[PDB]
Design an enzyme around this catalytic site. Structure first.
Site, PDB file in Angstrom:
ATOM      1  N   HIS A  62      -2.365  -8.303   9.071  1.00 39.88           N
ATOM      2  CA  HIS A  62      -3.188  -7.188   8.595  1.00 39.88           C
ATOM      3  C   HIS A  62      -3.799  -7.527   7.231  1.00 39.88           C
ATOM      4  O   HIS A  62      -4.717  -6.854   6.758  1.00 39.88           O
ATOM      5  CB  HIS A  62      -2.342  -5.925   8.486  1.00 39.88           C
ATOM      6  N   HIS A  92      -1.497  -7.603  -2.373  1.00 42.80           N
ATOM      7  CA  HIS A  92      -2.378  -7.983  -1.281  1.00 42.80           C
ATOM      8  C   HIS A  92      -3.723  -7.318  -1.507  1.00 42.80           C
ATOM      9  O   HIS A  92      -3.881  -6.530  -2.438  1.00 42.80           O
ATOM     10  CB  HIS A  92      -1.806  -7.521   0.064  1.00 42.80           C
ATOM     11  CG  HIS A  92      -1.610  -6.039   0.156  1.00 42.80           C
ATOM     12  ND1 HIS A  92      -0.457  -5.412  -0.259  1.00 42.80           N
ATOM     13  CD2 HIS A  92      -2.447  -5.055   0.561  1.00 42.80           C
ATOM     14  CE1 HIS A  92      -0.591  -4.106  -0.119  1.00 42.80           C
ATOM     15  NE2 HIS A  92      -1.791  -3.863   0.378  1.00 42.80           N
ATOM     16  N   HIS A  94      -7.588  -5.668   0.387  1.00 40.83           N
ATOM     17  CA  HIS A  94      -8.307  -4.967   1.447  1.00 40.83           C
ATOM     18  C   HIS A  94      -9.806  -5.191   1.316  1.00 40.83           C
ATOM     19  O   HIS A  94     -10.413  -4.693   0.369  1.00 40.83           O
ATOM     20  CB  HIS A  94      -8.087  -3.440   1.390  1.00 40.83           C
ATOM     21  CG  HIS A  94      -6.650  -3.104   1.565  1.00 40.83           C
ATOM     22  ND1 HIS A  94      -5.980  -3.228   2.763  1.00 40.83           N
ATOM     23  CD2 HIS A  94      -5.750  -2.616   0.678  1.00 40.83           C
ATOM     24  CE1 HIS A  94      -4.728  -2.831   2.607  1.00 40.83           C
ATOM     25  NE2 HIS A  94      -4.564  -2.455   1.351  1.00 40.83           N
ATOM     26  N   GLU A 104     -10.384   0.699  -0.317  1.00 40.25           N
ATOM     27  CA  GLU A 104      -9.785   1.823   0.394  1.00 40.25           C
ATOM     28  C   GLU A 104     -10.113   3.094  -0.376  1.00 40.25           C
ATOM     29  O   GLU A 104     -10.660   4.040   0.187  1.00 40.25           O
ATOM     30  CB  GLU A 104      -8.278   1.613   0.537  1.00 40.25           C
ATOM     31  CG  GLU A 104      -7.961   0.382   1.378  1.00 40.25           C
ATOM     32  CD  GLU A 104      -6.625   0.475   2.077  1.00 40.25           C
ATOM     33  OE1 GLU A 104      -5.588   0.570   1.390  1.00 40.25           O
ATOM     34  OE2 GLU A 104      -6.620   0.453   3.326  1.00 40.25           O
ATOM     35  N   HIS A 117      -3.940  -4.422  -4.342  1.00 45.55           N
ATOM     36  CA  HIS A 117      -2.790  -3.533  -4.453  1.00 45.55           C
ATOM     37  C   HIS A 117      -1.575  -4.324  -4.924  1.00 45.55           C
ATOM     38  O   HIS A 117      -1.168  -5.286  -4.267  1.00 45.55           O
ATOM     39  CB  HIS A 117      -2.467  -2.887  -3.095  1.00 45.55           C
ATOM     40  CG  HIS A 117      -3.472  -1.866  -2.645  1.00 45.55           C
ATOM     41  ND1 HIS A 117      -3.539  -1.411  -1.343  1.00 45.55           N
ATOM     42  CD2 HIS A 117      -4.438  -1.203  -3.323  1.00 45.55           C
ATOM     43  CE1 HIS A 117      -4.505  -0.515  -1.240  1.00 45.55           C
ATOM     44  NE2 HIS A 117      -5.068  -0.372  -2.428  1.00 45.55           N
ATOM     45  N   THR A 196      -1.031   2.704   2.791  1.00 45.98           N
ATOM     46  CA  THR A 196      -2.272   2.892   3.527  1.00 45.98           C
ATOM     47  C   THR A 196      -2.232   2.183   4.872  1.00 45.98           C
ATOM     48  O   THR A 196      -3.236   2.134   5.585  1.00 45.98           O
ATOM     49  CB  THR A 196      -3.485   2.381   2.717  1.00 45.98           C
ATOM     50  OG1 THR A 196      -3.328   0.985   2.446  1.00 45.98           O
ATOM     51  CG2 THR A 196      -3.607   3.155   1.405  1.00 45.98           C
ATOM     52  N   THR A 197      -1.072   1.619   5.198  1.00 47.62           N
ATOM     53  CA  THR A 197      -0.858   0.952   6.478  1.00 47.62           C
ATOM     54  C   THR A 197       0.446   1.508   7.049  1.00 47.62           C
ATOM     55  O   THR A 197       1.293   2.020   6.303  1.00 47.62           O
ATOM     56  CB  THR A 197      -0.685  -0.573   6.322  1.00 47.62           C
ATOM     57  OG1 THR A 197       0.446  -0.836   5.479  1.00 47.62           O
ATOM     58  CG2 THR A 197      -1.937  -1.200   5.717  1.00 47.62           C
TER      59      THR A 197
HETATM   60 ZN   LIG Z   1      -2.868  -2.159   0.376  1.00 44.56          ZN
END
Ligand SMILES: [Zn+2]
Length: 258
Positions: A62, A92, A94, A104, A117, A196-197
Site C-alpha cells: 500500500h 511513509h 501518500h 490525504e 506521515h 487513514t488505512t
Molecule cells: Zn499515511
C-alpha cells in the site's frame, strides 16, 4: 481479495470489511483555514530526532515504510497538544499519479503532490500494538510535499526504491536522518482522528504542519515507479494510494498560529 486503492477494492469499499470507516473521527479531512481556531494554550512541538536509528525500508503493498528502532526513547515527539512521550516507529508517504493530487489532508480544498506521515506511539502503552487500541495512542506528524526544488535529505530514500519495487521486498536502510525531511517552521493544525488505512482505528492525534517541503519532479517520479503487485505478477503501478477527505462531524481543528 483484500483492500487497496483500485476501483473494486478502493476506499469506497473499505467500510464493508472495516465498519469504523464510517466512524465519528475518521481521517483525513479538509482543513478550512478560516474555521480552524487559534488556541493560545497549544505548546510548541518538540521533535527530538538526534538519536534516531533507522533499520529497514519495505514495500508492503500500500506504500513503503521506513522503520526505526523503537525499543528506547531514541527519536521522540513531545509537546504541542500531546501529553507524554511518543516514539517514532515508521514513516511513509501518500502520492498521486499526477502532481495535482496525492495528499490525504487538504487545505482549503487544495491538494498537494504527496503527504509524509511520521507515526509515533504513546510510550505509556508499552508497545505499538496496545497503543492503537487507545484514543490517545498515536501521534502522526503530517507534512505536505509540493513539486519544485529537490529536497536533498530525501534522495537517500529515492535511490533505494529500485530494490523494493514489488510488494514483500525489504532492504537494510541504516543511518537515515529524518530531520532532513522537516520544513523550516513547525506551526501546525491539530485534531483527533484515525489511521487513514485499514484497520482505520480512531487512535490518532493528528499534527499537520502548515509549511510544505519541496521535492523535485524527478524525485516524485521515482515514487510512481513502485508496484502494488508482488514480483511475478502483472505490473500495477503504485500511484494514488491516498484516501479522500472524510466528514469532520463533531470536531474542531485547532491551530498553533494566528
Ligand atoms: Zn499515511
Amino acid at each position: 481479495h483484500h483492500w487497496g486503492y483500485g476501483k473494486h477494492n478502493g476506499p469506497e469499499h473499505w467500510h464493508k470489511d472495516f465498519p469504523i470507516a464510517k466512524g465519528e473521527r475518521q481521517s483525513p479531512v479538509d482543513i478550512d483555514t478560516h474555521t480552524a481556531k487559534y488556541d493560545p494554550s497549544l505548546k510548541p512541538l518538540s521533535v527530538s530526532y538526534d538519536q534516531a536509528t533507522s533499520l529497514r525500508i519495505l514495500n508492503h503493498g500500500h506504500a513503503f515504510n521506513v522503520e526505526f528502532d523503537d525499543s528506547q526513547d531514541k527519536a521522540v515527539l513531545k509537546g504541542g497538544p500531546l501529553d507524554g512521550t511518543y516514539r517514532l516507529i515508521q514513516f511513509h508517504f501518500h502520492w498521486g499519479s499526477l502532481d495535482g493530487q496525492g495528499s490525504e489532508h487538504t487545505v482549503d480544498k487544495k491538494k498537494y503532490a504527496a503527504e509524509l506521515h511520521l507515526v509515533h506511539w504513546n510510550t505509556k502503552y508499552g508497545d505499538f500494538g496496545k497503543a492503537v487500541q487507545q484514543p490517545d495512542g498515536l501521534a502522526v506528524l503530517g507534512i505536505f510535499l509540493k513539486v519544485g526544488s529537490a529536497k536533498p535529505g530525501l534522495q537517500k530514500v529515492v535511490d533505494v526504491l529500485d530494490s523494493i519495487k514489488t510488494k514483500g521486498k525489504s532492504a537494510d536502510f541504516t543511518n537515515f536522518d529524518p530531520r532532513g525531511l522537516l520544513p523550516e517552521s513547525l506551526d501546525y493544525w491539530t485534531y483527533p482522528g484515525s489511521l487513514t488505512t485499514p484497520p482505520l482505528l480512531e487512535c490518532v492525534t493528528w499534527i499537520v504542519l502548515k509549511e510544505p517541503i519541496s521535492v523535485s519532479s524527478e524525485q516524485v517520479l521515482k515514487f510512481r515507479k513502485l508496484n502494488f503487485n508482488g514480483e511475478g505478477e502483472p505490473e500495477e503501478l503504485m500511484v494514488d494510494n491516498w484516501r479522500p477527505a472524510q466528514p469532520l462531524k463533531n470536531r474542531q481543528i485547532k491551530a498553533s498560529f494566528k
